[model samples]
Target chain A: VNFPNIPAEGVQFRLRARDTGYVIYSRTENPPLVWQYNGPPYDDQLFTLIYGTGPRKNLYAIKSVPNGRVLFSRTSASPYVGNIAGDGTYNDNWFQFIQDDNDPNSFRIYNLASDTVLYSRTTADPKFGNFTGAKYDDQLWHFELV
Target chain B: VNFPNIPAEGVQFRLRARDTGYVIYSRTENPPLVWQYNGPPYDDQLFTLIYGTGPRKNLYAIKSVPNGRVLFSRTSASPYVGNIAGDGTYNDNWFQFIQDDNDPNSFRIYNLASDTVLYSRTTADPKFGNFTGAKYDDQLWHFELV
Candidate 1:
């Protein structure tokens, strides 16, 4: 996906697969960068990115957890650069991740491992840009991987 | 009236009256001072001083302009500040002040001697506050001058 001028500092572009349900490549920067991957030509995927300058770097990712057959999606952001990280997990065919941006230091993570968890800790920052004092409008992206 | 938390680096506050009329108060680095007047306590004949900070130390006196034998009712803050600058010819009636944040330096002023017309030139800088990206379902404000 392409954002004209957002996230203040830069923009991001990503690709996801429909059949296999996997993110192909994700990148973030001012102008934005694209990744080249050679894979099944019939795979379809969804892609999107976040761009801005706030307090920290942000990123979004979705995928199928190992040993699980369901698709999982997660979005998280932080105000610090070092704490940027994310991980997807699944259990009993259900996959989920805690999407948090409130805490500048850490985020809450979730997965199939815990069924009824109020919240979890996240050490990774989402792969997205930061925003200084600007507002962000939620955007949805839809596409296929060829 | 007094905003202490506001940074001294200069900020803007936008005040809009009920009838689509608005004014932008830009504070330069210096803080604004307020002056109160004492007179025959009358709702329509009150005088006050408004201090603003910026490159120019701007001072404004708000009073009710008289129209023939009838003094124009103090129209709260709405329609209060028009795009017009300076006091037009003594007998001129209507006035206008515009706050176009889009063009910080291009604010307009209209003098309504008969029909509103250009009056003078003034700088325009509309500053709100720390903006939260989230949208409020319903946000409204109503005021009445006892």
Candidate 2:
């Protein structure tokens, strides 16, 4: 899938799926972390690509500009990036923006929390489950410069 | 109003309230538009903002990207931009993106059909019954670049 104008700095952006046109955003008040897109103009849909630090270099954090929490993937157990806590510490909320080598435009998020990829397993209700690896379009994202 | 990157060409977007975080969406497979947003990754919410012309310049027509019907305001009697179906035309779907002069990050849409604006009347529920001119936040939007 091709994604145009991925940004290089901390700015407002969205992660759109090329296949389904669904964008992954958090909605974990009680329903847990789900990847669904109703529309934008809502705060949850616009994610800020914040540069972050960790045990290594060039790590970045995808945090919600409106809700003010990090897009955290807790574990591989339930496979949705629903966890939104930052713990108010350094690197604890960081995510690795791993780019697909063959498709530079598409990227996958490697959450340090679970060490698993941000996989999308959509049921009839559009929930975040799991699928292939980083190269798959379902799991991949466009930094999507708005 | 805060549309950091309102598309120059026709692009899909959503209208979200800055105060409430809920977006203006249609739940109708029929007529009589409603503003309800439990959550959807569906097509009903993808509003296509086309750079259009007609009554004036810089006017954009907001059309449903999914159903292919322009978001229209049928009559001022109901007082909401809830009617759709351009039949097959551009100017019929026009909406002026009114930038909030007070809040640089907020905006209100002026509909020629209703001769009013898109305003929210409740915090309890996402309803667009509170119709009026401009100069109100409920009738205004934050553009919420997605």
Candidate 3:
């Protein structure tokens, strides 16, 4: 896996799965659960790229703009991905953007803490997995700068 | 309100109300609710001072060691104080420690987002308020370095 050229400074962007155009969206709730929604990119779908510091200085934390929550693997709690939990530190939230060889424009979002790639196969919520035998498109993701 | 001497560098400490001696505790659960508990300083009561950056460089985010959740005021959501929510940013979580004139060792944890002070009357849960006319001891807090 090659390293994708994401901005090192930080930015506001939208993420979607390559297999489905469903974008990552967070509801307007205190402890919001993140899911993929098939619709126009709105405030709930808007996210900020938070550059990490200290040992994770190079990684990024995808933070929801609406709830101020960040995408966390929650591997200790469940295999599912959610934004409701994190120890204020970015240990379980930092992610690496690996370029997809098949499509240079696409990337694989790998969680450092869970050591699993973000994968989606249906309209259901996304999960963490190796997906060694699964469809390649399931773990492939696309990014749009906003 | 005089500016107290809190370490410019981050440090781990335990916060307790001066009058009740109930230390701040966060339950061992996802999205833990922060409250005052009467007991010895333990893991749940342990917190690290997170130094801010950029415009909030002078403030600090009181982060729980166990849950990674920071002290945040859900001003828009409710008047009550909780750590289950925060924009990945420290805007709503940053706090200023003002030295309480009555007790030099005590300080007031003031929220920058809600423009309120952390106060507790009985042990139900801490809420944000001015307490301009209430008992001064209700808002005064003491810190013990861990």
Candidate 4:
């Protein structure tokens, strides 16, 4: 089971158990980003994703399902896309990148797998800002199992 | 250079440098609380106070300033009702007490010299509940000096 399309560079994500709320695996990229989980390894049935751009920005928007097909994509100078895969290869069956919608200037999920599209929106929502701000412009992707 | 009701129980408070964000003191307490600060022991000023409920169902609140008069009085059950007479017994100017509000069952801060009021309130807000429901309750009060 896995989820995808967590937007926020350098933010860490984790897996949690629905029954016990115990963390399974957790990781973060740098400061100001954190993810946690509950439950034994491979026992995390459900989890939540939390991230923020700091005090002035507290926004949470996205969801995913486990063992199902989910996509991830980002639009910038170059577009990137991928799928949330379950193989326990990197970070315990996380979404592995299937294709790079934006090639050359690639958007990568460091230390995990290749890039892929976890999900897409038919109607463009202005809430999803384009990668422009040196710090908050670029859109990363992640998922949480409800 | 002084503020009335300088301290209270269960309130988040901190002191920061005027020119810099350097924090001088930061702390939070539940109840039956007491904190003390002395400039140089024998030659410095003294600040002391009691705050918070503890051991189940009982609460206390109080604060003191050496060579200075309190400026608030909210209740009659206050621990002290007169100007603080510094005790140099510990080789330092010190303040102490058991905060008692008008109600024996409750506690609150009072201005012994000036006549002002200080009180606290506790409530249940679902927004503050832990996402994992791990029996962890997060509560905070914040104060800043400009």
Candidate 5:
């Protein structure tokens, strides 16, 4: 929650890929799928980095402004992740922001539970993947203010 | 801005029908479809009556809590409705609530822009339609607090 380089909480921001420059977007789908899109920062692309409370206070939750669901990796289902929904809690929804020393303007979104950083297969397809390692551009991302 | 019978703005509620007792729901779809669904009010089934401002001050927008979308009719497409999304405004998103005299517990959702009321064909399929008249059970609806 007290990341020195992270953007201020509650303020709207867009997560763009350092590789393709495409922003991460939440399409209006049931089990809403998060994708990388070349865009103008629509509501689906706008998100807030929320800090956790209680024992998980230092953790961050990526919430979609459109759906109000927090981000969660579903490796069992697919490489893509979805927001916390229904009567769900933020149990496995916590994420950590790691500032890349190689790229000061970018960071890697790491999930402690999954032990994987957010990854993209290719800029052409631009789907999210929960893969280990952050050496590639697919795993590198930039958080830009809306 | 002031309606005696209508639920206060910002409070979440579920829209149900008297005939089947099925509540109106928003399925997680690209153009999130609003349909008649059975109990257990999930996120998609929860909504709020949002009051408009400026020229649309008196008008109300039915927003889905799951997607932050305002309800709107699409006669050209299927009978189902969707929430206002993307860069869309509340231009044709306004709806009026007409309390059914025959059943004080029930009401009709009328869309002035479409000149129609929210309709359903059968309890089996339970899809929403924009049709004229409000005499049948399909057209009559009720708003219950969540």
Candidate 6:
């Protein structure tokens, strides 16, 4: 993990949205939930990015570096998406990367498993992450590379 | 930290009821109140003992090893003990220890700060670590010393 926050396989990094600046994190352990942390991504803020193979090649599974639970979500029938589960079934173990057209270094993390872009959760929304149907900078991210 | 579990300062130990065989643990985190935790003190079942040397000495601050939160209580007239900030204001800090006269090594961990003992929480009752004017072996603990 770099100071600016890019992730290496063994190292851990905090994933924050470029727009809202909220870092992704967890709260409880049993029901294991993912929340949009407000400040610096310390404490439960750190996550590890593991490279995946098979159909998930070049993709990654976001996991809580401490507990090793992967970032995942279930099928939501609602109009918006929110509340990422830090721990889930094997089905919660995949995510793909889409480069942001606006910037060469930026990219959009899409959970094709859930068919939702990993967006920073807003206070207005009902869930932890965003489901506003508006794909904006809040959905964009850069590696904590340096 | 060992492959099993232990925290800094060498005080975190699992409080087991001399009578019921239940170890003290909580269901959640940060503000996740307390519970009997049922069974052995594995993972969340352990607690950290922090030495507080101010208004109280030899008396230690009891904390959840998982959350690093100190055992605390509200200002409510009723008696109940729960986790507050692991390290915080005077309110969140401070607890005294009194040895149980029955055993040479066993000790009763009393929250002298709140005038309560760490009891096994029952699902029938309201909060975690009840202090309903009853003294039981569940409030007694043994130091996990290596």
Q: Over 4 Å off in model 5, which ranges? A: A1-3, A30-32, A86-88, A121-126, B1-146
Off by over 4 Å in 3: A1-146, B8-10, B28-32, B84-90, B123-135
Checking candidate 6 for backbone clashes, the offending pairs are A5-A144, A5-A145, A6-A143, A6-A144, A6-A145, A83-A128, B70-B86
Model 4: chain A TM-score against the true structure:
0.20
Higher-lDDT candidate of 3 and 4: 3
Q: What is the lDDT ranking, best to worst?
A: 5, 3, 2, 6, 4, 1
> For model 5, how does the per-residue alpha-carbon lDDT over A29-138 read when each residue is reduced to its tens digit?
74437766774657888888776543333357888888887788645555357665632264457776766645666777866455467865553443666765325677
Find the candidate with the highest lDDT and give its number. 5
Each candidate's DockQ score against the native complex? Answer: 0.01, 0.01, 0.01, 0.01, 0.01, 0.01
User: Cα lDDT for residue B31, model 2?
Assistant: 48
lDDT tens digits, residues A29-114, model 4?
23211223233444223333323222101122212223322223334223232224432212212322111233322222311112
User: A1-146, model 2: which lDDT tens digit per residue?
Assistant: 11224466568887776556677776557565556674654666777766542222234667776677776554334544454566324333455555554566676665433445665545544345433222456666666666
- Winner of 1 and 6 under TM-score: 6
- Sort the predicted structures by TM-score, highest score first: 5, 3, 2, 6, 1, 4
- Native contact recovery (fnat) for each candidate is 0.00, 0.00, 0.00, 0.00, 0.00, 0.00
lDDT of 6 at A101: 48
* C-alpha RMSD by candidate, in order: 20.2, 20.4, 19.3, 20.3, 20.8, 21.3
lDDT for each residue of candidate 1 in B46-114, tens digit (9 for 90 to 100) = 222222222111112223222111111112333322222243212222222322223322322222222
Question: Is candidate 1 or 6 superior in lDDT?
Answer: 6
How well does candidate 5 match the true structure in TM-score terms?
0.45
- Displacement of residue A52 (Cα, Å) in model 5 is 1.6
lDDT, candidate 3, B1-146, per-residue tens: 32456754457778878877778775546443677677665798888777765434435788787777777754566535667443236466777676765577888886645545677567343342333222267788877787
Per-residue C-alpha lDDT of model 6 across residues B40-109, encoded as one tens digit per residue: 4466666766765432333466667677766665446443556566464444345444455455455555
* Each prediction's TM-score versus the true structure: 0.18, 0.42, 0.44, 0.17, 0.45, 0.41
